[PDB]
UniProtKB/Swiss-Prot annotation:
Changing residue 295 to A: Impaired nuclear focus formation, reduced interaction with PIAS and increased sensitivity to cisplatin. Binds constitutively to TP53BP1. Binds CDC27, which is itself a component of the anaphase promoting complex (APC). Binds PIAS1. Induction: During mitosis. The mRNA encoding this protein contains an internal ribosome entry site (IRES) in its 5'-UTR. This 5'-UTR generally suppresses translation while specifically promoting expression during mitosis, when cap-dependent translation may be impaired. May be required for DNA interstrand cross-link repair. Also required for checkpoint mediated cell cycle arrest in early prophase in response to mitotic spindle poisons. Possesses beta-lactamase activity, catalyzing the hydrolysis of penicillin G and nitrocefin. Exhibits no activity towards other beta-lactam antibiotic classes including cephalosporins (cefotaxime) and carbapenems (imipenem). Expressed in brain, heart, kidney, liver, pancreas, placenta and skeletal muscle. Belongs to the DNA repair metallo-beta-lactamase (DRMBL) family. This is DNA cross-link repair 1A protein. The chain holds residues 700 to 1040 of 1040 of the full protein. It is found in: Nucleus.
Length: 341
């Protein structure tokens, strides 16, 4: 049955709750972003209103085949009335089309649901600054102090320099980047740009990228692999076996692969700097794991919450164990005592 943390009290609304059948008393189903754990359950046979961003709407229509009549896109940063309740969608700094939702309840309560997000100081000068938030439904993916990682700008710097150096030394090297969902497009677009290449991929992945309103996208991607020296592959193919196999297919055009695995956090984060990352090598193939995160670090999360000063926090991630829940509640209390709300 639908868990409490996907229900919005005082409304007929739910958030990211599509895998429980018809939810009793739900008049509108919100979807924060197009990631499979969140959309799980939607299909072409859904007949209830779905509220979401323009980008998320493009993906529901084209990839899941949800019918146009049930898709309700809303612009960002705009006060909108939905079934007689005022709502605003805010950029979540997660994957393309990902949003946070502000709900202004008829009784005067204000609720923020972050969806998935990577907190940024820029959110402190959005429409959030303008009034008080009583309840916060929080993306707690990395709510523990061990979780550090560098900025997205730092990680992209490392990738661009790694690739540019390798291909300038060997013009017959191929670059491959793994993907399994939307998000992290900057990794492969930034590498292709420095190499003066389009990025080549499958027809299914090109279709997905054509939904994302990225400017000048036609100039940046292609289905013709042979014209391109940056290829995308399924993340499951990023290993020595899959890559050797892939190199055979290029028909003696390249003699080296350099590959990037964008991971979330990994325990090598607790010791090693981004400057000092090293690849896994077998022969003419090298695989780099790079810590490109689209979720808040512990410090970024703590700063956001201490700025917002919510009256109540409801976690939406790591809620399945008692030890996880207890751990999070302890951090929330420290933060509140340190900052004085
Ligand atoms: Ni996500």
């Amino acid at each position: 049955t639908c868990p409490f943390y996907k229900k919005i009290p005082g409304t007929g609304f739910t958030v990211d709750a599509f895998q429980y059948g018809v939810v009793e008393g739900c008049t509108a189903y919100f979807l924060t972003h197009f990631h499979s754990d969140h959309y799980a359950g939607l299909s072409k046979h859904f007949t209830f209103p779905v509220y979401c961003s323009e980008i998320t709407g493009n993906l529901l229509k084209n990839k899941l085949h949800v019918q146009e009549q049930y898709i309700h896109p809303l612009p960002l940063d705009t006060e909108c009335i939905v079934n007689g309740v005022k709502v605003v969608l805010l950029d979540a700094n997660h994957c393309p089309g990902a949003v946070m939702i502000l709900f202004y309840l008829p009784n005067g309560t204000v609720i923020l649901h972050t969806g998935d997000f990577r907190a940024d100081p820029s959110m402190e000068r959005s429409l959030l600054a303008d009034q008080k938030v009583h309840m916060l439904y929080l993306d707690t993916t990395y709510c523990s102090p061990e979780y550090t990682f560098p900025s997205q700008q730092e990680v992209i710097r490392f990738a661009i320099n790694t690739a540019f150096e390798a291909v300038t030394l060997n013009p017959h090297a191929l670059v491959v980047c793994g993907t399994y969902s939307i998000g992290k497009e900057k990794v492969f677009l930034a590498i292709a740009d420095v190499l003066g290449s389009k990025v080549g991929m499958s027809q299914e992945k090109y279709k997905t990228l054509q939904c994302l309103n990225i400017p000048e996208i036609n100039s940046l991607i292609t289905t013709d692999m042979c014209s391109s020296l940056v290829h995308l592959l399924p993340m499951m193919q990023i290993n020595f076996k899959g890559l050797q196999s892939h190199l055979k297919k290029c028909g003696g055009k390249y003699n080296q692969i350099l590959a990037f695995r964008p991971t979330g956090w990994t325990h090598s984060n607790k010791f090693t700097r981004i400057a000092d990352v090293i690849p896994q090598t077998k022969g003419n193939i090298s695989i780099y794991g790079i810590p490109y995160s689209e979720h808040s670090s512990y410090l970024e999360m703590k700063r956001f919450v201490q700025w917002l000063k919510p009256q109540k926090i409801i976690p939406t991630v790591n809620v399945g164990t008692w030890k996880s829940r207890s751990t999070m509640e302890k951090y929330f209390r420290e933060w509140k005592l340190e900052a004085g709300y």
